[PDB]
């Protein structure tokens, strides 16, 4: 069974956390993870791209001129699509891009991403990110450098760990989330995943019970 | 917008257990005096929709 040694920011070492095989030893599925990540990015997408159809463009109600006689092409509106300033035929309209990806697919993709991190030894556990009640990005940065040297790290800490969240949030590549919002997009985007001990235990309980 | 089923097709066609679309046969409603009982027996019951009409009847039944 995979083990993660809890690292304290003090430099010493507390105990270890077991990583359930069903959660951190799953075989990554590239197609499944790609679908889940694409669905996440589609949900993130703000489909607020709009145009005006010929009926929505101002004016244009009247027929520009006679049907016959003028010697010009027949027009029914100065806002017809071919006209300059006319409506857009098949232009964008606001739309919701989110997808109803199955819960099992989403959870399996997240578990596969975390399993890949575990297999590559990219998962770390820490009692906390800084010692004390005052946040310190200096201390958080030193501790994260001790833990890993990769550019991007997903910091998974509890909501009440506001000290750690504030301490670590302004580091360039560090991304901070809670164990309940853990997701394959962030896990894959991050080279390492630094769980708090409380966050890791919460995730394991939520996914095992 | 849900695809509305065609009312007449739904009232005139049925699907069996294996999915065969079945129908009744015409010329058995009235003017039956001159029709021999062999003909009305032929027209009795249900028959499978012809393969030619199966596509459109499926279209009408599903939407």
């Amino acid at each position: 069974t995979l083990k993660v040694d809890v690292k304290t920011p003090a430099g010493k070492t507390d105990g270890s956390v077991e990583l359930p095989a069903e959660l951190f030893d799953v075989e990554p599925n590239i197609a499944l993870m790609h679908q889940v990540v694409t669905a996440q990015l589609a949900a993130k997408r703000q489909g607020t791209h709009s145009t005006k159809t010929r009926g929505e463009v101002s004016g244009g109600g009247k027929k520009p001129y006679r049907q016959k006689g003028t010697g010009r092409a027949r027009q029914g509106s100065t806002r017809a699509p071919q006209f300059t300033g006319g409506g857009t035929v098949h232009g964008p309209k606001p739309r919701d891009y989110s997808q109803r990806t199955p819960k099992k697919m989403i959870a399996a993709a997240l578990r596969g991403a975390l399993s890949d991190r575990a297999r590559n030894d990219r998962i770390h556990a820490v009692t906390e990110l800084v010692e004390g009640q005052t946040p310190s990005t200096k201390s958080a940065k030193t501790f994260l450098g001790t833990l890993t040297e990769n550019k991007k790290v997903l910091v998974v800490i509890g909501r009440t760990d506001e000290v750690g969240a504030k301490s670590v949030r302004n580091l360039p590549g560090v991304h901070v989330i809670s164990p309940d919002q853990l997701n394959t997009y962030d896990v894959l985007n991050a080279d390492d995943v630094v769980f708090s001990v409380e966050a890791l235990n919460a995730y394991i309980s939520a996914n095992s019970k | 917008p849900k695809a509305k089923t065609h009312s007449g097709a739904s009232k005139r066609f049925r699907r069996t257990g294996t999915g065969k679309i079945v129908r009744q046969k015409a010329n058995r409603r009235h003017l039956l005096e001159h029709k021999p009982t062999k003909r009305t027996r032929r027209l009795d019951g249900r028959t499978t929709v012809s393969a030619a009409d199966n596509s459109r009847i499926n279209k009408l039944l599903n939407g």
Binding site: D116 | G8, A9, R12, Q24
Partner: protein, 145 residues
């Protein structure tokens, strides 16, 4: 590791959209519609047959009524009962639903001819003659409740 740039769709998952009416090297000009006609500019309704009596109008309406009061049953076969309960024991709607043999909230009708070989106390809404015979031969008890 697996980063985001390592994610790709399954082979054969994604297919290019058929962008029609883009030059003659693809489905160009008429865009697969052919030359003039109704279908050159719109879709013909499915129920339309050229003006002759459509099939759905020249064929008689199916006989009968629907009986809005019909009491349909969710059926269980004694073969499924054997597979689900190899050891025997009491069987009812609750554990039929648990084993996934019937819908959760429905009138269960037990029945079967698939060699019931377990003593089972089966309690369903109704039973068939063969259901009762199989239950009795296996040594169980059928109860309509």
């Amino acid at each position: 590791v697996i980063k985001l740039h390592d994610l790709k769709p399954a082979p054969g998952e994604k297919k290019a959209k058929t962008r029609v009416g883009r030059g003659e090297g693809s489905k160009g000009k008429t865009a697969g519609r052919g030359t003039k006609g109704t279908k050159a500019r719109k879709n013909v309704p499915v129920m339309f047959e050229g003006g002759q009596m459509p099939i759905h109008m020249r064929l008689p309406k199916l006989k009968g009524f629907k009986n809005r009061f019909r009491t349909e049953y969710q059926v269980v076969n004694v073969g499924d009962i054997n597979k689900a309960f190899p050891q025997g024991g009491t069987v009812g709607v609750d554990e039929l639903v648990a084993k996934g043999l019937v819908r959760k909230n429905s009138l269960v009708k037990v029945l079967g001819d698939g060699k019931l070989t377990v003593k089972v106390d089966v309690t369903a809404n109704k039973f068939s003659g063969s259901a009762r015979e199989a239950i009795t031969a296996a040594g169980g008890s059928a109860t309509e409740l």
